[PDB]
C-alpha cells in the first residue's frame, strides 16, 4: 500500500550522461554507442539566442570545438552533424555503459522520468508528465540543457526527452531523441505562447482506482454516467474529452476494483462539480492527473 | 525554475540490490564490501511472524540456507550474524559496484530517497520523510522487504532506512541500516500503533521559501508574528514547536528570498487559520512538509 510519484530507477541513464563544450557554452549530452546527443543551442553564445542560425553558426564550428567530458576524462569527437534541434556528436569510443535503447516519440498525457543533470552529472530523478499541450512541468535551472526524459521497460531505455528551454511561464519545452520540439516551441529567445493546458482525464480517473485500491474511497458515490454526459462536464473543467480508447485501458483497473468506468465518471463529475469539501485522496487536495492506467497498474502489482 | 519532489539519483543504490531467500521467504538485501544486510524476518514463515523467536529461529539456519543472488549469480555466503533487526550474511565476493558510503540514522523531519526493490530488482525511485511518528508514507507491497532509503553527498551514499512492515494503517516502518527500527516498531505480526503525526513546520515552511523563489507570492502578508504567538497556532493544527535551530536552518532561505523568517511564520499563520481558498501553491493544494531547508536549497541552487 501508499502512493508515490515514482520515478524510475536511473541508473541506466546515468551511464551515459556527459558534460558537452562548445565556446563558452556547457551543458549536458546523451552518450549511447559513439554516439552523443545534446541539444544544438551549445553552439550559440547568449546573444545568438536571440535570432540564432543553426546552420551559420555550426559553419563556424569543427569537431575539436566540441569537448566531450564522460565523468573526468576527455572523449574524441570525430564527427558532428545537426539533425533538427540536437547535435550529433560521433566519438571514437562507444558508450560501456549503454544500456538496451530504443529512441520513441511519446503521446501527450503520457508520463516518464527525468534525470536533472548539471555539468555532465546527475543531481536527481523525478517523474513528470507529457501536458496535453506539449510542456512539462519539471525542476530544472540554467545548465539542466540535454537532461534527458525516459521510460524503462525491464533492461531497455526508451528516451522520450530531451530538455531544451524553459519558458517565461516557468514551464519545459524540448524535443524527442530525433531533435523534433514537442508541441509548437523553437530553440529562441523569444515570447513563446504554450496553448491551453488540459487535465488528462483519463489519468485522474486511473489515480481514482490507485485511491480505491488503497483504501481512499470516501469519493465513491451512487451514481453513474453516460461518456457523452461526463464530456460535457469535463469540457467546462478543462478536462481532455474521454474516449472509448481511454474507458479500454481503464479495463484492468475496472477490473481490479469491480468499480465500472463509467460509475467511476460519475464519481469524477460530483468532484469536479462539488470540489473536495476539504478533503483529500491520497495525500493530495487537488485531482492528479500524473499517473497514467499504466504507472497505476505498475505501481500496485509491483513491475520490476 | 519549477519544483518536484526529486529523488536522488539511484544509480550507486541500484549496484548493491540483490535477492536473499531463505526457506521459502524472498526479499531484497543490501550488498555493499563483502556483506549483505537483509530484513532478519527472512528466516521466517507467515506463521513465525505472529510471534517470532529470532534467536531460535536462526540456529535451525546454516549459511548454504541464505541464498544471495546479485544479478542473476549466486553469492557464497560464508557467515551470518544478526544484529538488531537485520541479518548481515558474509559473502565471499567484494561487490565491485560498492559505493562510497555510511551508514547514518536521520532524525524525523528529515527526507531521503528510496529505491523499491522486488526480487533484488529496482522498480522505482521516490522521494520521503521519517514522519515525526518515525513512520515513512511509502509505496510498498508484498516482496518490497529490504528496500533502502539514503541520500547522496557528491560521491558518498548515506543508508538510512531499510523497509521491513507495513502497519495496518497502510504507512511504513523500518530500521537504519544497524537494525534498530524507527520509533516503538516491532518485526512482529502483531497490532502497532503509530503515535500521533505532526506536520514538520520547519519543512512547510521552506517549501513556502521555495514557493516565493518560484515565483508563487499569494500567501505573502503585511504580517508578522513572535515564535512564541505563532507555536500556539501551530499547537492548534497539529504542526510541531519551531524553534530557534529550525529559525537558522531557514536562514539561507530567509536571505535568499529577503522575508524574515518570522515573516514568513506570519504566512503560515494565516494560510492555518484561513486555509487555501480554493488556491495552490506550486502546484498543491495543501501544505507540503516533505522537502528539508537544504532540500529546497539543493533544488533551486542545483548541486550534483
Ligand atoms: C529562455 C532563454 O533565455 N534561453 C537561454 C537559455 C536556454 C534555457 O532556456 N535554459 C533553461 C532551461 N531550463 C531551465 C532554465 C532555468 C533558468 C535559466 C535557463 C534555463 C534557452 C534555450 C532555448 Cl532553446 C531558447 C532560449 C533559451
Ligand atoms: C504485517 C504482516 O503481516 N507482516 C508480514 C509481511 C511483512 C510486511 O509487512 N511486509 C510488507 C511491507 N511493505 C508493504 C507490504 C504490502 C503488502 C504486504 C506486505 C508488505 C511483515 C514484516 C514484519 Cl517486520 C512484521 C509483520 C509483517
Known sequence: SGFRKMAFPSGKVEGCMVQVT???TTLNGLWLDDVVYCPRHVICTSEDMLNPNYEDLLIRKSNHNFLVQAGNVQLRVIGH??????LKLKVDTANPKTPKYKFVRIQPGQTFSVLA?????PSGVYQCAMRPNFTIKGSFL??????VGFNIDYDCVSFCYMHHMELPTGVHAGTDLEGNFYGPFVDRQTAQAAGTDTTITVNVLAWLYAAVINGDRWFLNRFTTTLNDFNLVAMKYNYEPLTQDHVDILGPLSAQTGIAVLDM?????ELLQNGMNGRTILGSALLEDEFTPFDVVRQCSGVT
Open 22 to 24: 562548445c565556446g563558452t
Open 81 to 86: 552533424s545537426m539533425q533538427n534541434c540536437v
Open 117 to 121: 543533470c548539471y555539468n555532465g552529472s
Open 142 to 147: 540554467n545548465g539542466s540543457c540535454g537532461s
Open 265 to 269: 465518471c460519475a464519481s469524477l463529475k
